[PDB]
Structure formats: C-alpha cells, structure tokens
Amino acid sequence: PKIKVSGPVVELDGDEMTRVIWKLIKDMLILPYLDIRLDYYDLGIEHRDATDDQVTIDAAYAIKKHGVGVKCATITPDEARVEEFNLKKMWLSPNGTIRNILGGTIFREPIVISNVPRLVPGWTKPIVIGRHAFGDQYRATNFKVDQPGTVTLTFTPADGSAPIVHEMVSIPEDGGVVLGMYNFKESIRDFARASFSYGLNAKWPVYLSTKNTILKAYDGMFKDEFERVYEEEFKAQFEAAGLTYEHRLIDDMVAACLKWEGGYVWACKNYDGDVQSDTVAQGYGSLGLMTSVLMTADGKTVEAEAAHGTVTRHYRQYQAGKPTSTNPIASIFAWTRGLQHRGKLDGTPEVIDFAHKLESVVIATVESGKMTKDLAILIGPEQDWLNSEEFLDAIADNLEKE
Amino acid sequence: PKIKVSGPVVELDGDEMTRVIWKLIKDMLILPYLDIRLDYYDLGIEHRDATDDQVTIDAAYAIKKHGVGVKCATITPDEARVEEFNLKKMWLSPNGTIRNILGGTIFREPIVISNVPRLVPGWTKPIVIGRHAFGDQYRATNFKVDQPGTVTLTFTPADGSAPIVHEMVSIPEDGGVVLGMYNFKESIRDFARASFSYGLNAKWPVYLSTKNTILKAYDGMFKDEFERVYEEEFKAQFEAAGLTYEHRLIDDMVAACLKWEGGYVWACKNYDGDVQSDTVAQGYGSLGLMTSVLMTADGKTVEAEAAHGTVTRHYRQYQAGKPTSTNPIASIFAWTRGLQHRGKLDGTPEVIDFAHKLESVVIATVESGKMTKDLAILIGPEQDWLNSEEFLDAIADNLEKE
Ligand SMILES: NC(=O)C1=CN([C@@H]2O[C@H](COP(=O)(O)OP(=O)(O)OC[C@H]3O[C@@H](n4cnc5c(N)ncnc54)[C@H](OP(=O)(O)O)[C@@H]3O)[C@@H](O)[C@H]2O)C=CC1
Ligand SMILES: NC(=O)C1=CN([C@@H]2O[C@H](COP(=O)(O)OP(=O)(O)OC[C@H]3O[C@@H](n4cnc5c(N)ncnc54)[C@H](OP(=O)(O)O)[C@@H]3O)[C@@H](O)[C@H]2O)C=CC1
Ligand SMILES: [Cl-]
Ligand SMILES: [Cl-]
Ligand SMILES: [Mn+2]
Ligand SMILES: [Mn+2]
C-alpha cells in the first residue's frame, strides 16, 4: 500500500509561500503513497542564518553523495532581506553554492497542459533551455572612460613564451565603454556533456546556438567542443535512438523556437540562456508551469526545483489569514522529477510509475477546469479558479481515486 | 489633378526580382498619381560595378543633401556573385556604405494585416526594433588559446596618465576563449536620438533594453546616456505627445514582446537588435511584410527599403518566363514611408494622406482575400494566391476607387 523507495532523497526546505505549499505537497501527495527516506535540510532563511549558511553546503554535499535533490524555492539575501530577518551576513545565493559544489548545467523545462493556452499557439511540446552555467558576460571586466585612449587585450602564456598583444581600438574624445570576457574549454565541454545527457534521458534532440559567423574563434570553440563531445561520447547512443544533434546560428534558433512545436533541448551560451529562458517562460504564461533541473555531465546527479521564487506576495496574504491562489505544479513536478531519477538509479519501476501517475493526475485535474488563478487568467475571465488548498485537495482526491 | 510633391525624392535602384517589382510599383502606383522629381541612382549590381561603386557614394550624398531616399533591395557581393557578375572587386554592402555616410539607426517596421495570422495572436500592433548601428560584438577582438595563461585588458589614455590595467583571469590548462569589445559615448547618444525621433514620428512610446544588472559600467552608459538625451531633448515633446520612455532589463523586454499587444519602438543594443529582429520577423511570417528604415539622429534624413533581399529564386523563374508570386508590400511601403517624410519636411499634407491611403489600400486589398503565395500559407493549406502582376494589378485597381 506504501510503495517503498530504496535510496535516499535529499529534501531542501525553503521559504515563504513555497514553504507553506511545499509541506502540503509532502503531506497530501507524497507521504501517503511512499515509504521513503527523506534526508532533510532546512534552507529556510532562519536556519541558514542560524548556521551561518553551513546547512547549504551540507545540503549540497548530501545531494552529491546520493544523487537526488528536491528543493523548495528560497530567499536570496539582499539588503532588504538583511533587515527583515536580521541576517548576520549577507549570505550568498544558495543556488549558487549548490551549482558550484555540484557542477552541472541548469535546464528549464516547461509543463504542457492542453487547455491552458500558450501565448504561441503553435507550441505543443516542451522547449527545454539549458544555460551554460559559467562565463561570458557574467564574469566580464567592464568599465567606462570619459576620455580618449587606446585599448589592448593581452594573453600572457604561463610557460613564459611571448605575450600575445591585441590592439583593439582608439576610443575618441568623449570616451565610451570597454568590456573583456572569457570562457574555458573544460567548462564548455562539461556544458555539452550535461546537455547531451539531458537530451538522451528525455529522448529529445539537441541544438546549440552561437553567433560564430561574427565571433569565429570565441564561438567556434562552443561549436567545436559540442561536435567533439557529440561524436566521441554521445553520437552512438543518439543515432541510435532516433535522436540528433545540431549547431545553429542564434538568429535561426530564435526564429525556430517561435515556429517549431517544441520537443528539443536548446543549449544556449550563458547570456542567450538567460534571455531566451524568459521568452519561453512568458510563452507558457506562468512560472507555476516551469521546472529547473540541475543535471551533472554524466548525468548521475539531478536536482529539481520550481523555476519560480517564494511568492512573497502570496505569503503576505497567507500571513494575514487571507486567501491565496498559489500554483503547486512546478513544485510537485520538482518532487516527481526527483522521484523519477531516484527509481531510475534504484531501479524500482513503481517509484517511477508513481512519479508519472502523479504527474498525469495533475495534468488531468487542470484539464477539467480545476486550477489556480495564474492558470485561469490564461484561459479567460469566465474561468473561475481554486484557492491553493482547494487546488491541492482536488489533486489529492483525483489522486486518491487511484 | 495629380498630387504635387514639392522637394526631390532620391531613388536607388536595385537587383533581380525586386528590380522588376520595383518598376511595376513606380509605374502602376506612384508616377501616375504624383508629380515627383526622382533623383535617380541605379544601384543594380552592374552599374555599381561600372562605376567601381562610386554610384553608391553618390546616392548616399544625394540622400544627405535632400533628406529623403527610397531604395530597392540590392545584391551584396560575395564570391559566387563576383563570378556570376564578373565583378572587378568585391564591392562592400551598399547598405553599409549608405549607413556610414548618413549615420543614423535602422528600424524594422512590420505591417500588421488583420487576416494574416502572426504566430503570436496577441499581436495587434507593430513591434518596432531599432538596432544600434555600431560596436559591441560586431567589432570585437576574439581568439582561442590552447594553453594556460593570464588575460589583461588595458586602457592607455592619450594623456600619458596612468594606463588602467585590469587583470581579467587565468585560463586553465586546457585553454579557452577571450573576447574584448567596446562602444563609443558619441555613438550611443546618437542611437538614443534617432530612437527618440523615430518613436515620436511613428507616434509610439520608446523602450531601451540592456543587461546593466550585470554589465554595470558598459550598459550603465547606454541607460545613462539614453536618459540624459531623453530629459534634455525629447521628454517635453514626448509627454506632450502622449508618449513615454523607459529602460528595461532585456529579460523583461523579451517577455513583454511576447505578451504585449504591440505599438512601441524597442531600441536594442547591436546584438540584441540582430537577434530580437529575427523573433519579431518570424512571428509575422514573411519579410514581405517588413521594412527597414534608416533615420538620422536629428531626424531630418530618412531612407527606406524592404527588409527582404532581391528574391533571387523568384527571379530565376521570371528570367525563364514562369510565373512569380512576389510580395511587393514591403517595397510599396518603402515608397510610402519616404513620401511620408518628404511630405513632412515640405510640409505638404496631400503627399502624406496619399502615402497613407496607398498603405491602407494595400492592407484592405489583402483583407478582401487577394494576396501573394507568401501570405497565402500563413493562412491555410488553401487560401489561393495571386501572381505578381495579378495582385499588383488588384492594388492599382483598388486604389483607384479613391
Ligand atoms: N530558490 C529559487 O529558485 C528562486 C528564489 N527567488 C526568490 O524568491 C523571492 C521572491 O521572488 P519574486 O520573483 O519576487 O516572486 P516569484 O517568482 O516567487 O513570484 C512573483 C509573482 O509571480 C507569480 N507567481 C510566481 N509563482 C507562482 C505560483 N507558483 N503560483 C501562482 N503565482 C505565481 C505571482 O503573481 P501575482 O503577484 O500577480 O499573484 C508572484 O507574486 C526573492 O527573495 C528571490 O530571491 C526567485 C527566483 C528563484
Ligand atoms: N539590399 C537589402 O536590403 C538586402 C539584400 N539582400 C540580398 O538579397 C539577395 C537574395 O538573398 P536571399 O536571402 O536568398 O533572398 P531573399 O532574402 O530576398 O528572400 C529569400 C526567400 O524569402 C522569401 N521571400 C522574401 N521576400 C519575399 C517576397 N517579397 N515575396 C515572396 N517571398 C519572399 C522567398 O521564399 P520562397 O523561396 O519559398 O519563395 C525567398 O526565396 C542576396 O544577394 C543578398 O545579398 C539580403 C538582405 C537585404
Ligand atoms: Cl560564472
Ligand atoms: Cl559596427
Ligand atoms: Mn533571464
Ligand atoms: Mn539577425
């Protein structure tokens, strides 16, 4: 009657509305049906502040040992959060700490649900975007000048052979701006690996965008290392399984994203992934329908969380005792996803089928007219909606019936 | 009775299929309703070759002098064309030479036709992407290194005052890639100016996008200069005209692009301009429906042309006698756009309304059914299309009734 989960699931608790909602998932939709070993780590801001953020390093190393992480959305501290919670220091983003201890690439996977319209009716399958987790603009040296002068870019070899000096330009009277940015071959290779691993697992084809027509050397390495990694360690499984890999120019790929139906993993350079991810998420109308999804190169370790944050605005409402309409879908799909990989490693098809059934019940509940406000308004103003508890209860029943 | 155009309209002839349609347009829709002095410059490949491209300089200085140009699509030489046409040398893009003589910014204006579907149905009004004409990735220095080493980026002021030496990074054992790029304050102010004059003359509010959360100095200048320029030169007028300017993050602007209805000018940095234009054009389905549209900073000079090329595959057909279904909408609109501004500078309202009437008459003509194959399959696997003269016959006729 309770399906036995074999290995552990690391559970990373979090903050505000998602913490409220995250417990109700665990108690109504996980814990009834599963006898399961949950390795718990409270990454709620209080408990990170109370351990000076060690709990986060612990949480990461636990994910790393056991291969599965399911995570509630968490507050990233800033000057306002420092005052609100009386933080001892401004603790760094926990995602950053986990990314960094785990390595691996973040993938944004949307959830398609027939009667919830996307802003591009053509879409029909999930468009997954994987975003190089390292480098380019996000590590840039950039600065301004209010005056004339010349700009030089030098590579100094570590073996002491001659510097390679590039004379870039002369900036005129009124000054301007200057920026230098880089990436690593190792990182680039590691980016392709996770990408192919992710596409293999989902059985989606894979695309790389670059702008190698303009940056021949810089983006040539993205193209070259993607093709090497594909050929050496991925091509035979791809072919193989009907799957494919291509490089396309970024200009083609953004048009393609708009035109195609979905069903592929688009690997983007760091900046492209930050931007495109926001085009695709907008398409689906609501972040309650978006997961992400850290997968390692190999791809043995997965960590899943809702792509949205902690829904402070809803939390302020719940705190007053007022009603809320918070979408639980991504959070649930974070859990279902973690369980998926867990039974994969386990290899206990029952945990997997439970994952999938849960998923289907959810899709089925909404394809019925039972939904939270963020979905309803996508449909129309005629469409009424469920408050957060109501929506989870609905799921819970529709799930009970099987 | 024919409408009297005051000043001269500089006309720039072009290539292949577009050259043909372009005469039909002149002869059927323009000359026979207007009393216009065309200062004519033939930019078909042959005459460019016969003048060693001087004609291109002459056309550009003509536009400078007279404030108005309308231009047929032209061939940009590469290796195949050098052979096809026996070119004496590989002449540079006449668009790039025009741009550089005139300065200014390129605006992509799509033509939104009620009965032609756009892949994003919520779009009821044109999204106008203005692209910075200069710098960033398009002038970068970029290289790969297959070894470890350090990267320094240095501004050496003309002064002889201390060079500012930034130590960017050490690249690990397997090497990596490095880029340096820049832009000029003087260029950035100009880009703001044409962006403002453009949005005012289209009666559209104006948005800029940057990523200044990450590139605080580099994009800091784009936002700061755009804002200065804005308050010091356009806010009075803008406010008076019921119009508004905002900076937004690129992540928000791509989201707004999909969800908003349209009806704004979107000033993108060079790269984001390159890319977002392709998302917008794909949404509209056909470059038959797209113009670009150079406006100078001040903004007394305008030069328009269709955003598509010379439509070679069609020409091959027309050379061989078979029928062609080439959309002249964007070209007619290049003419209508130019008359508008010629009408404006003069200032002679009958010119303007004519421009307007011809436009609405083209739209109305497609609204009644009757369209090139082009637009046809935006609509359905069967929607019946006219061939090139057949549809442009129809427009001649329709315009007639008024
Ligand atoms: N741990 C993580 O992965 C992330 C954490 N964050 C953090 O969360 C905090 C607050 O984030 P913020 O971006 O402001 O807000 P959210 O992304 O959490 O949500 C913003 C708005 O989007 C809507 N929304 C988001 N998710 C849902 C949902 N599941 N169901 C219904 N509506 C939803 C709501 O609309 P409306 O108000 O109109 O009802 C909400 O107010 C910050 O501290 C930030 O650091 C942010 C991103 C990721
Ligand atoms: N001066 C300028 O503004 C520009 C000039 N060019 C030049 O144009 C030349 C041809 O380039 P190329 O990109 O291959 O051809 P085009 O870019 O002009 O058009 C390519 C295809 O798009 C479709 N298409 C574009 N315009 C129309 C239209 N008005 N009506 C119907 N279909 C249309 C056709 O589809 P289908 O094949 O299915 O019929 C056509 O084959 C090149 O020499 C290039 O240098 C390119 C861009 C700009
Ligand atoms: Cl980084
Ligand atoms: Cl340039
Ligand atoms: Mn983003
Ligand atoms: Mn482009």
**∠ CA(B82), CA(B88), CA(B91), 5° rounding?**
65
Write a three-state SS string for chain A: CCEECCCCEEEEECCHHHHHHHHHHHHHHHCCCEECCEEEEECCHHHHHHCCCHHHHHHHHHHHHHCEEEECCCCCCCHHHHHHHCCCCCCCCHHHHHHHHHCCEEEEEECCCCCCCCCCCCCCCCEEEEECCCCHHHHCEEEEECCCEEEEEEEEECCCCCCEEEEEEEECCCCEEEEEEEEEHHHHHHHHHHHHHHHHHHCCCEEEEECCCCCHHHHHHHHHHHHHHHHHHHHHHHHCCCCCEEEEEHHHHHHHHHHCCCCEEEEECHHHHHHHHHHHHHHCCCHHHEEEEEECCCCCCEEEEECCCCCHHHHHHHHHCCCCCCCCHHHHHHHHHHHHHHHHHHCCHHHHHHHHHHHHHHHHHHCCCCCCHHHHHHHCCCCCCCCHHHHHHHHHHHHHCC
| Ligand 2 proximity of B74 Cβ (cutoff 6 Å) | yes
For ligand 2, atom 34: residue with the closest CA: B311
Phi, psi dihedral angles at B179 (to 5 degrees): -135, 145
Which of B259, B246, B16 lies closest to B121 in space, CA to CA? B259
Ligand 5 midpoint to CA A274 (Å): 4
Ligand 2 closest atom vs CA B312: 10
CB count, 10 Å around CB of A27? Answer: 12
| Ligand 1 proximity of A326 Cβ (cutoff 6 Å) | yes
| Ligand 1 proximity of A176 Cβ (cutoff 6 Å) | no
Ligand 2 closest atom vs CA B307: 3
Spatial contact of B246 and B208, defined as CB atoms under 8 Å apart:
yes
Spatial contact of B182 and A178, defined as CB atoms under 8 Å apart:
yes
Q: For the domain that residue B119 is a member of, what is the CATH number?
A: 3.40.718.10
Which of B189, B265, B273 lies closest to B223 in space, CA to CA? B189
Distance CA B379, CA B382 (A): 8
Residues of B in contact with A153 (CB under 8 A): 141, 151-154, 178, 180
User: What's the reported resolution, in angstroms, to a tenth?
Assistant: 2.2
Q: Are strands A176-184 and B176-184 parallel, antiparallel or unpaired?
A: antiparallel
Phi, psi dihedral angles at B293 (to 5 degrees): 90, 70
Distance CA A274, CA A292 (A): 13
Please tell me the number of the ligand nearest to residue A56's CA: 1
Distance CA A293, CA A334 (A): 8
A362 touches chain B (CB under 8 A): no
A228 touches chain B (CB under 8 A): no
Across chain B, which distance is largest between two alpha carbons, in Å? 79
The structure tokens listed for B139 are 């002038």
For residue B152, the one-letter residue type is T
Distance CA A140, CA B214 (A): 8
Which of B381, B283, B274 lies closest to A259 in space, CA to CA? B283
Please tell me the number of the ligand nearest to residue A132's CA: 3
Ligand 1 closest atom vs CA A307: 3
Sequence length of chain B is: 402
The structure tokens listed for B101 are 């003589």
CB count, 10 Å around CB of A382? Answer: 6
How many distinct structural domains can be found in chain B?
Answer: 1
CB count, 10 Å around CB of A369? Answer: 13
B151 contacts A153? CB cut-off 8 A: yes
A122 contacts B119? CB cut-off 8 A: yes
| Ligand 2 proximity of B44 Cβ (cutoff 6 Å) | no
| Ligand 1 proximity of A209 Cβ (cutoff 6 Å) | no
Segments forming the whole domain that contains residue A184: 1-402
Distance CA A210, CA A252 (A): 10
Write a three-state SS string for chain B: CCEECCCCEEEEECCHHHHHHHHHHHHHHHHHHEECCEEEEECCHHHHHHCCCHHHHHHHHHHHHHCEEEECCCCCCCHHHHHHCCCCCCCCCHHHHHHHHHCCEEEEEECCCCCCCCCCCCCCCCEEEEECCCCHHHHCEEEEECCCEEEEEEEEECCCCCCEEEEEEEECCCCEEEEEEEEEHHHHHHHHHHHHHHHHHCCCCEEEEECCCCCCCHHHHHHHHHHHHHHHHCHHHHHHCCCCEEEEEHHHHHHHHHHCCCCEEEEECHHHHHHHHHHHHHHHCCHHHEECCEECCCCCCEEEEECCCCCHHHHHHHHCCCCCCCCCHHHHHHHHHHHHHHHHHHCCHHHHHHHHHHHHHHHHHHHCECCCHHHHHHHCCCCCCCCHHHHHHHHHHHHHCC
| Nearest-by-Cβ selection for B119 from A171, A173, A259 | A259
Q: What's the Rg (C-alpha) of chain A? A: 23
| Ligand 1 proximity of A292 Cβ (cutoff 6 Å) | no
Residues of B in contact with A187 (CB under 8 A): 176
Which of A120, A128, A249 lies closest to B274 in space, CA to CA? A249
For ligand 2, atom 22: residue with the closest CA: B311
Please tell me the number of the ligand nearest to residue A290's CA: 1
Distance CA B74, CA B3 (A): 29
CB count, 10 Å around CB of B161? Answer: 10
Which of B108, B115, B159 lies closest to B304 in space, CA to CA? B108
Which of B164, B297, B171 lies closest to B234 in space, CA to CA? B297
| Ligand 2 proximity of B294 Cβ (cutoff 6 Å) | no
Locate the chain A residue with the closest alpha carbon to B176. Answer: A184
Name residue A303's beta-bridge partners. Answer: A69, A294
Name all contacts of A383-390 with Cβ < 8 Å and 24+ positions apart. A385/A325, A386/A325, A387/A323, A387/A324, A387/A325, A388/A20, A388/A21, A388/A24, A388/A314, A388/A324, A388/A325, A388/A326, A388/A328, A389/A24
Spatial contact of A218 and B177, defined as CB atoms under 8 Å apart:
yes
Whether the ω angle into residue B273 lies within 30 degrees of 0, i.e. cis, is: no
Distance of residue A163 Cα from the nearest chain B Cα, in angstroms? 9
CB count, 10 Å around CB of B138? Answer: 16
B119 touches chain A (CB under 8 A): yes
| Ligand 2 proximity of B310 Cβ (cutoff 6 Å) | yes
Residues of A in contact with B158 (CB under 8 A): 147-150
Write a three-state SS string for B34-56: EECCEEEEECCHHHHHHCCCHHH
Phi, psi dihedral angles at B4 (to 5 degrees): -95, 115
The structure tokens listed for B129 are 């992407």
**∠ CA(B131), CA(B136), CA(B141), 5° rounding?**
145
Locate the chain B residue with the closest alpha carbon to A281. Answer: B255
A349-364 burial code (b ≥16 CB/10 A, e <16) = eebbebbeebbebbbe
B 234-273 residues with CB < 8 A to A: 250-252, 254-255, 257-259, 271-272
Ligand 6 midpoint to CA A286 (Å): 28
The structure tokens listed for B291 are 């113009």
Name residue B9's beta-bridge partners. Answer: B38
B165 touches chain A (CB under 8 A): no
Distance of residue A124 Cα from the nearest chain B Cα, in angstroms? 13
Q: Positive or negative, the Cα torsion across B143, B144, B149, B151?
A: positive
Token pair 């499984």: residue? A237
Please tell me the number of the ligand nearest to residue B387's CA: 2
A168 contacts B141? CB cut-off 8 A: yes
Q: How was this structure determined?
A: X-ray
Distance CA B130, CA B206 (A): 10
Ligand 2 closest atom vs CA B325: 31
Sequence length of chain A is: 402
| Ligand 1 proximity of A308 Cβ (cutoff 6 Å) | yes
Ligand 6 midpoint to CA B228 (Å): 29
Ligand 1 midpoint to CA A366 (Å): 21
Ligand 4 midpoint to CA B134 (Å): 4
A154 contacts B180? CB cut-off 8 A: no
| Nearest-by-Cβ selection for B176 from A159, A177, A184 | A184
Distance CA A298, CA A189 (A): 12
Sequence ranges of the binding site of B: 71, 74, 76, 81, 251, 274, 278, 309-311, 314, 327
